[PDB]
Scaffold this motif. Sequence first.
Motif, PDB file in Angstrom:
ATOM      1  N   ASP C  72      -3.469   9.700  -4.258  1.00  0.00           N
ATOM      2  CA  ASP C  72      -4.350   9.784  -3.083  1.00  0.00           C
ATOM      3  C   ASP C  72      -4.129  11.125  -2.385  1.00  0.00           C
ATOM      4  OD1 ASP C  72      -5.606   7.059  -3.081  1.00  0.00           O
ATOM      5  OD2 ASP C  72      -3.464   6.464  -2.903  1.00  0.00           O
ATOM      6  N   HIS C 109      15.481  -3.765  -3.452  1.00  0.00           N
ATOM      7  CA  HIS C 109      14.031  -3.868  -3.632  1.00  0.00           C
ATOM      8  C   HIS C 109      13.506  -4.996  -2.750  1.00  0.00           C
ATOM      9  CE1 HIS C 109      10.328  -4.593  -6.368  1.00  0.00           C
ATOM     10  NE2 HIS C 109      10.058  -3.946  -5.239  1.00  0.00           N
ATOM     11  N   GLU C 118      -8.375 -16.082   2.139  1.00  0.00           N
ATOM     12  CA  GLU C 118      -9.796 -16.361   2.558  1.00  0.00           C
ATOM     13  C   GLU C 118      -9.863 -16.602   4.057  1.00  0.00           C
ATOM     14  OE1 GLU C 118     -10.815 -19.756   0.037  1.00  0.00           O
ATOM     15  OE2 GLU C 118     -11.256 -18.377  -1.658  1.00  0.00           O
TER      16      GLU C 118
ATOM     17  N   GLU D  81      -4.654   3.302  -7.024  1.00  0.00           N
ATOM     18  CA  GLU D  81      -3.508   3.228  -6.103  1.00  0.00           C
ATOM     19  C   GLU D  81      -2.552   2.095  -6.506  1.00  0.00           C
ATOM     20  OE1 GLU D  81      -1.722   5.147  -4.207  1.00  0.00           O
ATOM     21  OE2 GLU D  81      -3.174   5.237  -2.518  1.00  0.00           O
ATOM     22  N   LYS D  82      -3.141   0.961  -6.871  1.00  0.00           N
ATOM     23  CA  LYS D  82      -2.393  -0.235  -7.291  1.00  0.00           C
ATOM     24  C   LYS D  82      -1.666  -0.026  -8.625  1.00  0.00           C
ATOM     25  CE  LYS D  82      -4.098  -4.328  -6.533  1.00  0.00           C
ATOM     26  NZ  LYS D  82      -3.094  -4.705  -5.524  1.00  0.00           N
ATOM     27  N   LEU D  85       1.384   2.106  -7.709  1.00  0.00           N
ATOM     28  CA  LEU D  85       2.341   1.220  -7.023  1.00  0.00           C
ATOM     29  C   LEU D  85       3.092   0.328  -8.018  1.00  0.00           C
ATOM     30  CD1 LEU D  85       0.256   0.189  -3.923  1.00  0.00           C
ATOM     31  CD2 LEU D  85       2.136   1.851  -4.027  1.00  0.00           C
ATOM     32  N   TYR D 112       0.271  -7.985 -11.929  1.00  0.00           N
ATOM     33  CA  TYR D 112       0.024  -8.455 -10.542  1.00  0.00           C
ATOM     34  C   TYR D 112      -1.397  -8.094 -10.175  1.00  0.00           C
ATOM     35  CZ  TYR D 112       1.046  -9.083  -5.516  1.00  0.00           C
ATOM     36  OH  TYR D 112       0.939  -9.575  -4.244  1.00  0.00           O
ATOM     37  N   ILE D 114      -4.956  -9.345  -7.936  1.00  0.00           N
ATOM     38  CA  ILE D 114      -5.607 -10.243  -6.974  1.00  0.00           C
ATOM     39  C   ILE D 114      -7.102 -10.238  -7.254  1.00  0.00           C
ATOM     40  CG2 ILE D 114      -5.978 -10.742  -4.527  1.00  0.00           C
ATOM     41  CD1 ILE D 114      -3.191  -9.432  -3.994  1.00  0.00           C
ATOM     42  N   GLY D 120     -15.205 -18.224  -2.087  1.00  0.00           N
ATOM     43  CA  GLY D 120     -14.197 -19.274  -1.838  1.00  0.00           C
ATOM     44  C   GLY D 120     -13.328 -19.626  -3.054  1.00  0.00           C
ATOM     45  N   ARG D 121     -13.068 -18.637  -3.915  1.00  0.00           N
ATOM     46  CA  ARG D 121     -12.215 -18.812  -5.111  1.00  0.00           C
ATOM     47  C   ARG D 121     -11.386 -17.556  -5.436  1.00  0.00           C
ATOM     48  NH1 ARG D 121     -12.759 -23.542  -7.764  1.00  0.00           N
ATOM     49  NH2 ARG D 121     -14.577 -24.823  -7.251  1.00  0.00           N
ATOM     50  N   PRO D 122     -10.185 -17.469  -4.867  1.00  0.00           N
ATOM     51  CA  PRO D 122      -9.226 -16.381  -5.141  1.00  0.00           C
ATOM     52  C   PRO D 122      -8.146 -16.781  -6.163  1.00  0.00           C
ATOM     53  CG  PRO D 122      -8.519 -17.481  -3.137  1.00  0.00           C
ATOM     54  CD  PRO D 122      -9.782 -18.188  -3.630  1.00  0.00           C
ATOM     55  N   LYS D 152      12.647 -11.170 -10.998  1.00  0.00           N
ATOM     56  CA  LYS D 152      11.910 -12.146 -10.178  1.00  0.00           C
ATOM     57  C   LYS D 152      11.824 -11.708  -8.707  1.00  0.00           C
ATOM     58  CE  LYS D 152      11.892 -16.904  -8.410  1.00  0.00           C
ATOM     59  NZ  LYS D 152      11.622 -16.515  -7.036  1.00  0.00           N
ATOM     60  N   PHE D 155       9.814  -8.296  -7.330  1.00  0.00           N
ATOM     61  CA  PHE D 155       8.354  -8.246  -7.426  1.00  0.00           C
ATOM     62  C   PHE D 155       7.688  -9.434  -6.721  1.00  0.00           C
ATOM     63  CE2 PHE D 155       4.446  -9.031  -9.696  1.00  0.00           C
ATOM     64  CZ  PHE D 155       3.902  -7.767  -9.726  1.00  0.00           C
TER      65      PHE D 155
END
Lengths: 170, 170, 170, 170
Positions: C72, C109, C118, D81-82, D85, D112, D114, D120-122, D152, D155
């Motif tokens: 960025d 970490h 939502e 960006e993700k 990261l 990972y 999202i 209404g469904r994530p 574990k 993250f």
Amino acid sequence: KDLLKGLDQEQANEVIAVLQMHNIEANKIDSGKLGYSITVAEPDFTAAVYWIKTYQLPPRPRVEIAQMFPADSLVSSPRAEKARLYSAIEQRLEQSLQTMEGVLSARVHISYDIDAGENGRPPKPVHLSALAVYERGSPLAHQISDIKRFLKNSFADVDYDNISVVLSER
Amino acid sequence: KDLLKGLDQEQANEVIAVLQMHNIEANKIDSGKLGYSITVAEPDFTAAVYWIKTYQLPPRPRVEIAQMFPADSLVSSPRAEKARLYSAIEQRLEQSLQTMEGVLSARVHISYDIDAGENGRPPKPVHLSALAVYERGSPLAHQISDIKRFLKNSFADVDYDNISVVLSER
Amino acid sequence: KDLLKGLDQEQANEVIAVLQMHNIEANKIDSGKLGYSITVAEPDFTAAVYWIKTYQLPPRPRVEIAQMFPADSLVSSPRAEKARLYSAIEQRLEQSLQTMEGVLSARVHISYDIDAGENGRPPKPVHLSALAVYERGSPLAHQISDIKRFLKNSFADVDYDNISVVLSER
Amino acid sequence: KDLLKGLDQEQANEVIAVLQMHNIEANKIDSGKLGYSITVAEPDFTAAVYWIKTYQLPPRPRVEIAQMFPADSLVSSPRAEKARLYSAIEQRLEQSLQTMEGVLSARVHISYDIDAGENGRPPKPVHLSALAVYERGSPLAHQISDIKRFLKNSFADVDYDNISVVLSER
């Protein structure tokens, strides 16, 4: 072996006196600027560092409220202004308490916030923390109530129950 | 064999004294800038590195809040300002606690956040973590309650149950 | 045969000492810049590489959060700022834990995310992972609970059950 | 016959040692830049190539996340960006695991994401893949559970059942 250079006369005098009182052979030299350097024999170096560290020497620099340039470029309203107003009050209190015979140092940390929890819900946080160091030859324990009352009435919306006054002998 | 160059007088003195106390033949030289270099005989190099590493030498540099230039170019409001206000408080607390006889180092990490979970739901996170290192010759265990009270009343909306005070002998 | 050039004094000393302790004939030379080169006899080259690799030498460079320029060009808000705030905290924790006698290295970490699943559904992820390496001559197993408590109270919204503290002898 | 030119000291040393251990007459020369060339007798050329290929030499270059210039010209938001990261985290994990005695190399690939399936469904995809290579003389099989726990808690939103840890001897 060199300990520290560029010491103020007071910092150098306090460190020199502390080392001399603990049987450490320390010498002092003044530079061109009037700043002081302290040195010890190599055989006393480890002891000298232990004694200095145990007595908070050399005194650390902590954040200065005036050095706010890194955080914001201009102040037109409230959070930064309130921090400076609070700092001025803490200094005014420290100045006042410092006049009490026996006080050799004092720190005041004040809490005064006006928060809005939500619509029709205003909270007010109050409290003060006071640390005073007294001379070895003066008991200021009897003056705790007087110190609390002075702090209470110097600051907006403070109660006695929300003031901590701690007195410690040097 | 060279250990480290460009050491401060204090860092060089503490490392030299630690090595000498462990029967390691170490020598020191000052450069033009007043910075120090430590060296050991090649036969003591492995031992010397083991001892230095075991005692956290040389001290690591950690992120400086002032070195925020990489993260943002200007600050007109809240998250960065609050981080600096928090840092100033942590430093003020460390400065105050450092005056207690026996304290040779102190770290304070404060948590104070005002969050909005959703409409009509405000949370407040509070807590403080305090680590103080005491001189070998001073027991500060009896002063834990006093230290907790000083921390409690220095900071907005803190309770005793949310303060951790750990004292460790050097 | 050359092993590595342009080594720091510490990296070169640790590798030289490791090789010497395993009966490998290694020699060191300093260049003009004060950087170090390590070399071994050709008959010990294969063994030397095996030993160095087995002990994580030379240490790898990993992504630096500051080297974000490729990702960025400017930061006016939240994801990048929060990563830097998190990194500052991880470093503050590592700095604090590193003062515990016996600690020779530490990695922290942290996980702290505020997510919106939502409308009318906010989640909060918390957790910390802590790895500390202790000196061969110090058992830090008894200090696990103290380390967990220090980590817990340094960071927003952390519980003990979501902290992993692993201690490994060098 | 020339094998390869412009090798790093480590790559050249590992290939030379592998060939010498398999009774292949290999010679090495350093160029002006400090880069290395490996050569073998013509009668050993076919064998030498077979051995090098069987041991993944020379190591291939794979896509570098930083070499994203061909894919996009500027990044103002989320996917790129993700990825950076995530790469930073993978490197942080690899750096941490690499400190475990016996580890000579490690690779971490994290998942990972999202996602929004529809209104209404994530969904949330989590998982990690970890490959660690151990020294021939160290069994890290007993450390699998510790490695999984470290991964574990480093993250966001990872469960043990979604972590694969594979350990292979060099």
